[PDB]
Design an enzyme around this catalytic site. Structure first.
Site, PDB file in Angstrom:
ATOM      1  N   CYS A 113       0.854  -1.311   0.035  1.00 10.32           N
ATOM      2  CA  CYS A 113      -0.180  -0.030   0.095  1.00 10.32           C
ATOM      3  C   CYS A 113       0.750   1.377   0.013  1.00 10.32           C
ATOM      4  O   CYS A 113       0.392   2.130  -0.314  1.00 10.32           O
ATOM      5  CB  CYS A 113      -0.990   0.082   1.166  1.00 10.32           C
ATOM      6  SG  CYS A 113      -0.052  -0.403   2.671  1.00 10.32           S
ATOM      7  N   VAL A 149       0.417   4.261  -2.448  1.00  8.33           N
ATOM      8  CA  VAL A 149      -0.170   5.562  -2.170  1.00  8.33           C
ATOM      9  C   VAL A 149       0.892   6.734  -2.650  1.00  8.33           C
ATOM     10  O   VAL A 149       0.101   7.663  -3.149  1.00  8.33           O
ATOM     11  CB  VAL A 149      -0.170   5.686  -0.474  1.00  8.33           C
ATOM     12  CG1 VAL A 149       0.015   6.960   0.188  1.00  8.33           C
ATOM     13  CG2 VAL A 149      -1.440   4.917  -0.066  1.00  8.33           C
TER      14      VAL A 149
HETATM   15  S1  CLF Z   1       5.222  -2.875   6.239  1.00  6.48           S
HETATM   16 FE1  CLF Z   1       3.812  -3.283   8.229  1.00  6.48          FE
HETATM   17  S2  CLF Z   1       2.636  -4.945   7.484  1.00  6.48           S
HETATM   18 FE2  CLF Z   1       3.221  -3.755   5.589  1.00  6.48          FE
HETATM   19  S3  CLF Z   1       1.180  -2.452   4.992  1.00  6.48           S
HETATM   20 FE3  CLF Z   1       2.977  -1.446   6.455  1.00  6.48          FE
HETATM   21  S4  CLF Z   1       2.420  -1.248   8.558  1.00  6.48           S
HETATM   22 FE4  CLF Z   1       1.269  -3.002   7.062  1.00  6.48          FE
HETATM   23 FE5  CLF Z   1      -0.686  -3.952   5.296  1.00  6.48          FE
HETATM   24  S5  CLF Z   1      -2.636  -3.757   4.087  1.00  6.48           S
HETATM   25 FE6  CLF Z   1      -1.495  -5.259   3.018  1.00  6.48          FE
HETATM   26  S6  CLF Z   1      -0.055  -5.791   4.520  1.00  6.48           S
HETATM   27 FE7  CLF Z   1       1.007  -4.108   3.427  1.00  6.48          FE
HETATM   28  S7  CLF Z   1       0.078  -4.178   1.541  1.00  6.48           S
HETATM   29 FE8  CLF Z   1      -0.665  -2.560   2.977  1.00  6.48          FE
END
Ligand code: CLF
Ligand code: ICS
Ligand code: ICS
Ligand code: CLF
Ligand SMILES: [Fe+3]
Ligand SMILES: [Fe+3]
EC number: 1.18.6.1
Lengths: 522, 383, 522, 477
Positions: free
Chosen positions: A152, A156
């Protein structure tokens, strides 16, 4: 204290008197816990219809979702291709989570890399990450192909995957002819199945879009099979087995069955099997393309119909009796191959099991959840068994899918008490199974908490969970099961009827109380 | 990390929501952003706790704002405020909320701190904004630091002006023990048998009130210094509370740590420490006598040595040269090569491993893994 | 009373207050029931070691046996031959029972006839019954062969089966050339597996004894497979599949898998599949004969070695890892066919599942029972898993089989706490699981009554039953499962590990009491 | 089908038999004439089965041990002989009971002498005496023992009566020798008779001189209800709601004490005439206890039976009967409203043992269904005397039907539903004809009484209208 001959793990070790006293002292002295009467009254309140009405008014808070994010499905799609490394452009924590999720479901190694995008990339973009990561991944793991998705963060900040990969190829970080298909997989759109669809469309476009001049539909006498997001190895196996029995040339595109089921022989195999690049290059020459899970293969359908010019048949997921029949008959019509006697006999054997188990299956009420195609196939099969689905939940469902499922339910007398819920989570479903109690739930491991909650209300209110779907974390090797075709219908039927019979045996096991009905023969 | 290479390294969110804040049972932790992170982290760590899940405890639950495209485009502050209202409605017994930021929160300009302040004032509730966006830092370590800073800023000093807690000279706080399989409980029983009062224990089985009571203790016993060293130094500087590391992994380490801890108190505590060691000597001695013969000489590839040496297992520190019987330092990759992989806390399936009670479980698990016949069946008889 | 919207069957209808009052009145007024205090006292006494010592002193009384009588196995063996009618010379009650037993286990039609010997034949013999019955059976059901066994009445009277069949042929009741193999199957000797052995030896002798001059060992390049008494259809199927994967020519003698699994397609098929008479006649031309369950195929072994001159290999039942390896290697040596890569991969996947589940399996205590070959194969596999058999019961075992199982246990560190019982019934095993409580039982449906008993002592004393064996009456379609080969080992492993995990989930489901260990991930 | 058509169908089916078997079977198939009272003029029953024809009948041991004696919960019943008979009959009949199994109740257990070759050669009387001692040691709360002889007992010249006498005198215990060897008679029917005679000779007269039981004018005994799925209980609650006291149940949930108390009752309500008419007649001639047949299958038969029973007593019982009928009228009327539209017009063919083939006709007709074929394994001619009036004109009647005969009849008649046993069930399910087990109630029930009628209607509807029956033809076939 521990007796060396009868060592106790956490349960029941912490049930010993000293641990109980210690925990009571902790709670009474320092936790400032709400009194047990207050906790009991609040729990009882959460089981009521007024709480359900408040619960279904939610519009900003989601509790216990029944879905994941797109890159998970993208990674699963990438895994199904020969010597292919899934590559998620973005932050490393996502890849750690994806690998852990699939490891726990499959109990196998899961290969996936990240280019470890950080704050510096959060300002300047992820282009240098892309160049370095593609180069390092190719040098270290020696894949034939690298399939690129996004987290994401990269979505973004709007990283241009096409431009980034093109610049990596132009500057020599990776060979210009090395296959690097990509797909934008934003986690704030759709779900994991949408990520699978996007990844597959990206790979198919990469390998076929620019070389359609020399392609002739039907010239290779094969049928393309696109399975979609699938976490039962038996489903890949049964599709291949049925097509082989029929004598039908086929091309299973995204086949992760081997890489998720490597043997333990003292050697670690990074890659095993998978759809070859030649297969995907030759895919437009197929007679047609069949999408096993059409309700999350819409982008793939649009590309296949618009570019390969394949007349993709309108087919439901081959689940249960009628839809397996329809799938087989469509395949027969496309390939010109008759349905063989072995498949006819297998269908008859499924019908025989249905007749043997109908009395115990009839009228049983099920809550159920999962992905759209799987849920609708399960609903169809439950209707075929004379069962009554009551609470049909698809968190990643849409209005068109709900309309189709409502049409399915209207076609059967057994769907008259069924409601389809889209965009609802497992806290909503917890409310539903309290207020309109089903006999059983069918769903993934996350249902185990709901069952726990129902048991807290009382043994008479407990709704047992039947584990079908993804992910299954608290049981072993269920990912080897089958849910597709006659074989999958047989396995599902056995699971359902024997779950019913196990529950009945438990309810009638009380000496001189309920064991008058503890029959030897059922 | 090096781009394009596999690693199991987590993100800052995994260090803040997964490790530090998530185990706090009576709080509701909101995975702010898209659905993925909260789902993958849901009940993924075995931080054991006592409570009524969904009523007064919420550890195994996944609360999320489930960001959609419109949330990305126009921000999620209004969504966060409405979510906090809905949390208040549907879970009235929660004792506080934390807002664990996922990656997009740090990139779309959302201001969770202002929302937290306004909503916390409105509801008279502790709402802790944690800017633990996953892209920050290289691992979960920065996430540990961010979560500790949030603890200090929003929770730790809540009772600075309160003096109603009745203190005793034997007041200790167990910090940085995440109660993996009940490890912290197995430590706490020994500490209380020493005559100490464990006033605070967090994050594992932790409550928000215990964190608030931590500045009132006489000693800070830190298990995981790695994640909880910032807060310990802050507490020493501000409240004058000394802190020390303890290690209850194996009888040798446990006995040494118990003696070191009791040396910080009066002679009565030291006498009780000697009594505890005497009471538990036959049990761990029986464990050693049973399991050391089955494990003596076996090599471990590697808070680390103690229990392994108590069972006669040689510790070592490329994998086809050492020929290690077990890797202590990617479980399934090692398993495919025929080498068991296990760790110091029973992360996956078992435990506790700490304290005298945990030592028996650890020794049994070591024998079960190392001597299982499955590891001897890799080569087919015809190959 | 019944609410038409929610109709209750016997459970829970008889839990209604009016029914409870009625039953209490009946008991108090007329049953002269022992006081509940005395009943509790006696039950507790039945759970003790003193009771166990009295129970194991039994010399004349058998309670809840774990075996059937010979003609049942004879009927099962006869069913494995093409268009063959099982025919039990004797009284008809036996055939009614045999058919009901197999109907309930397989949920399939079971064809078998009797010649309905009555008091008249008890003094005159059943020769007239034989003539009329053979004629009527041939005319009515049109079998290609009639396979004759005996009930105990005929064995006690001393009816000469050979003379009776010869006189029926000589007097025109059946054609001289119509195949009528026979076997004496006295119910007071051995058990049902003995009946299978006697029936098979009779059929093989009938078709091969007088035509041995033209036979040459190894001339048809095939391996004979004798499965023995087998009630899992998957075992026949897996043996056939594994031999076909190896490219090994084989003849499965007595194959009933088709007739016990006919499709429900609107037509009843009294006969389906089965071993042909040509296969039986050509059996001596095989390279060798492999006995899948040697411990009850001793008469067959003597006949095959002494007449066909086949050097029958010393092979255990192909159950678990090691014995499947030995079976496949012996088949490879006999046929000259290498073990294919698919079987090597399947073995590796079994080992992988073993490694994935060993933490939950290791040290688990099992009481098990069944037939000798099945029981020893299960014991071997449990030892391979690191599990501890404690109570090994085989009602129809013998001293030599017990010696073999003791040798197997002595060769493993996990057999130190194991005891082997022969001649003991399920009441003995009930005492055993009360006095030396295992974690689980592995057995047939009769074990359910033991589990009920243990639950009555307390939840902490309950011993859950895992249904593997024959007969399984209270679950559906388990007869389709597999226990032989790598596939069977995988199925057994999955059943065991998930039984363990289900029990653990049940024990940790208590809210705020034990659910601290109700892990999502196992 | 007209009468001539049914006669032609019978002849066409019979043509496949040899002349002896065909001539015999011709006498056991008939086309019903409801006016005919003497069923001997049209059909023949209680004869030996033809050898090799796949009969459905059981043996005398099944009739005595499996039917009459086994349900008695506080007694221990020994399957005397080789292991087979007791094992195949263990817990296969759903004769429900209340007790603590293995302590004070023993119904689902299998006690056997497990005869070996030496027992056959040298006799098993000493083994029987030792077995009785071991039973006494290990099950002290048993209130009696029965010894059900299997086939070898009567062929090796064993004297179980002398052993029963000696051990019963020594232990002060009722030990009942039953000579129910499977080769005796032609079916379970003689097993019923032998078991009834054993009851009369060894148990029933125990309290003839005992006058300490306080009797009431409303004392009845339920005879011949074996509590299949709770059937007897569902019957009992109606009788007790009518103001009667049910002193004894024979033998479902039965105890030896209520059997001994039966000679003190005022009325014997016989459900299964076939299995217990012998003991009922004996009780009438010895104690002067009247007995009457009743039927609690379906609301119509249940109401008629309740009124006929209440007419045997004073006006207070009749008023209570009217109250019971009024109380239950809305419940079974709701059941009919729900299920008769789904079942109106459907045609049923039945083949059960001795009583139900005529007994369940009224329950089927209460749901708008018509019984076109019925038959018995082991009924006598007096049972068929009661079936002609209860069945439709030109309907099929079959006595001890062979599997081939019943399959051909079903192929030519094509009923919507068949009610028979476990041996026929999967045969007719394979043909795609809905099948209901009429012995075990398909592990459902009870079916007796108003409570049982709701379950029966739900079961018939769920089976006859199951979607599975529409799927036996593949869409490409
Ligand atoms: S590094 Fe950590 S786990 Fe990654 S997003 Fe960022 S806070 Fe979360 Fe989240 S919904 Fe899926 S798992 Fe990511 S692509 Fe985004
Ligand atoms: S916090 Fe860290 S990875 Fe120090 S992120 Fe990780 S509960 Fe590990 S080696 Mo999981 S720095 Fe704790 C850890 Fe150690 S989650 Fe636990 S076991 S002592
Ligand atoms: S006793 Fe008889 S065969 Fe009257 S032997 Fe049989 S429990 Fe049937 S038609 Mo099974 S004369 Fe009872 C009977 Fe009817 S076992 Fe049950 S159902 S009403
Ligand atoms: S007609 Fe009836 S069931 Fe038959 S024997 Fe005779 S009493 Fe019994 Fe028994 S052990 Fe087996 S099943 Fe028989 S062959 Fe003997
Ligand atoms: Fe694995
Ligand atoms: Fe079947």
């Amino acid at each position: 204290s521990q007796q060396v001959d009868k060592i106790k793990a956490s349960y029941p070790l912490f049930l010993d008197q000293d641990y109980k006293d210690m925990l009571a002292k902790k709670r009474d002295g320092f936790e400032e816990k709400y009194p047990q009467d207050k906790i009991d009254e609040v729990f009882q309140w959460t089981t009521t219809k007024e709480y359900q009405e408040l619960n279904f008014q939610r519009e900003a808070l989601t509790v216990n979702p029944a879905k994941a994010c797109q890159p998970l499905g993208a990674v699963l799609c990438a895994l199904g291709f020969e010597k292919t490394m899934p590559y998620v452009h973005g932050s490393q924590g996502c890849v750690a989570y994806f690998r852990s999720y699939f490891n726990r479901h499959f109990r196998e190694p899961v290969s996936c890399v990240s280019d470890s995008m950080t704050e510096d990339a959060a300002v300047f973009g992820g282009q240098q990450n892309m160049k370095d990561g593609l180069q390092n991944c190719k040098a270290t793991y020696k894949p034939d192909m690298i399939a690129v998705s996004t987290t994401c963060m990269a979505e973004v900040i709007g990283d241009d995957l096409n431009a980034f990969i093109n610049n990596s190829k132009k500057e020599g970080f990776i060979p210009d002819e090395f296959p690097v298909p990509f797909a934008h997989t934003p986690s704030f759109v759709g779900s994991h199945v949408t990520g699978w669809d996007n990844m597959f469309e990206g790979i198919a476009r990469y390998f076929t879009l620019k070389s359609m001049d020399d392609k002739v539909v039907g010239s290779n006498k094969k049928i393309n099979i696109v399975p979609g997001f699938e976490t039962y190895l038996g489903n890949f196996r049964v599709i291949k087995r049925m097509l082989s029995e029929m004598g039908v040339g086929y091309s299973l595109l995204s086949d992760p069955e081997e890489v998720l089921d490597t043997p333990a022989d003292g050697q670690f195999r990074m890659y095993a099997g998978g759809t070859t690049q030649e297969e995907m290059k030759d895919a437009p020459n197929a007679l047609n393309t069949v999408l096993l899970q059409p309700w999350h293969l819409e982008k793939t359908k649009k590309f296949v119909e618009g570019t390969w010019k394949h007349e993709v048949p309108k087919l439901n997921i081959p689940m249960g009796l009628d839809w397996t029949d329809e799938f087989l008959m469509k395949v027969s019509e496309i390939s010109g191959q008759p349905i063989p006697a072995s498949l006819t006999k297998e269908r008859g054997r499924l019908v025989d099991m249905m007749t043997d188990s109908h009395t115990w299956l009839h009228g049983k009420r099920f809550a159920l959840w999962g992905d759209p195609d799987f849920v609708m196939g399960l609903v169809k099969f439950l209707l075929e068994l004379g069962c009554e689905p009551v609470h049909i939940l698809c968190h990643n469902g849409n209005k068109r899918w709900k309309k189709a499922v409502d049409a399915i339910l209207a076609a059967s007398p057994y769907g008259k008490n069924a409601t389809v819920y889209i965009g609802k989570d497992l806290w909503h479903l917890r409310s539903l199974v309290f207020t309109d109690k089903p006999d059983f739930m069918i769903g993934n491991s996350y249902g185990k908490f709901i069952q726990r909650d129902t048991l807290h209300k009382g043994k008479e209110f407990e709704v047992p969970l039947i584990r079908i779907g993804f992910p299954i974390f608290d049981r072993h090797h269920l990912h080897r099961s089958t849910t597709l075709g006659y074989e999958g219908a047989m396995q599902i039927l056995t699971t359902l009827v024997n779950s019913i019979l196990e529950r009945l045996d438990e309810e009638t096991r009380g000496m001189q109380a309920t064991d008058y009905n503890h029959d030897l023969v059922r | 990390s090096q781009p394009g290479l596999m690693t199991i390294r987590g993100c800052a969110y995994a260090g803040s929501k997964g490790v530090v804040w998530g185990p706090i049972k009576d709080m509701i932790h909101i995975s702010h952003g898209p659905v993925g992170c909260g789902q993958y982290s849901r009940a993924g760590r075995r931080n054991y706790y006592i409570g009524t899940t969904g009523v007064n405890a919420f550890v195994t639950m996944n609360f999320t704002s489930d960001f959609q495209e419109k949330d990305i485009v126009f921000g999620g502050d209004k969504k966060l405020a409405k979510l906090i209202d809905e949390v208040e409605t549907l879970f009235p017994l929660n004792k506080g909320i934390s807002v664990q930021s996922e990656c997009p929160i740090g990139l779309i300009g959302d201001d969770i701190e202002s929302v937290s302040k306004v909503k916390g004032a409105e509801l008279s509730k502790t709402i802790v904004p944690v800017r633990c966006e996953g892209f920050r830092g290289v691992s979960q370590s920065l996430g540990h630091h961010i979560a500790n800073d949030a603890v200090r800023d929003w929770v730790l000093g809540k009772r600075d002006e309160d003096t109603t807690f009745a203190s005793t000279p034997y007041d200790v706080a167990i910090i940085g023990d995440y109660n993996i399989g009940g490890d912290a409980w197995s430590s706490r029983i020994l500490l209380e048998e020493m005559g100490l009062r464990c006033v605070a224990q967090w994050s594992g089985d932790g409550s928000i009130s215990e964190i608030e009571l931590t500045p009132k203790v006489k000693l800070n016993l830190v298990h995981c210094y790695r994640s909880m060293n910032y807060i310990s130094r802050h507490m020493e500087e501000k409240y004058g509370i000394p802190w020390m590391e303890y290690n209850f992994f194996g009888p040798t380490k446990t006995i040494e740590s118990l003696r070191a801890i009791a040396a910080k108190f009066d002679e009565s505590i030291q006498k009780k420490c000697e009594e505890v060691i005497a009471k538990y000597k036959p049990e761990w001695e029986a464990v050693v006598a049973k399991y050391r013969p089955r494990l003596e000489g076996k090599r471990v590839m590697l808070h680390v040595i103690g229990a392994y040496e108590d069972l006669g297992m040689e510790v070592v520190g490329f994998v086809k040269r050492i020929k290690p019987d077990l890797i202590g330092s990617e479980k399934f990759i090692f398993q495919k090569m025929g080498i068991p992989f296990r760790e110091m806390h029973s992360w996956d399936y078992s435990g506790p491993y700490h304290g005298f009670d945990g030592f028996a479980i650890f020794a049994r698990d070591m024998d079960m893994t190392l001597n299982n016949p499955c590891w001897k069946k890799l080569q087919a008889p015809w190959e």
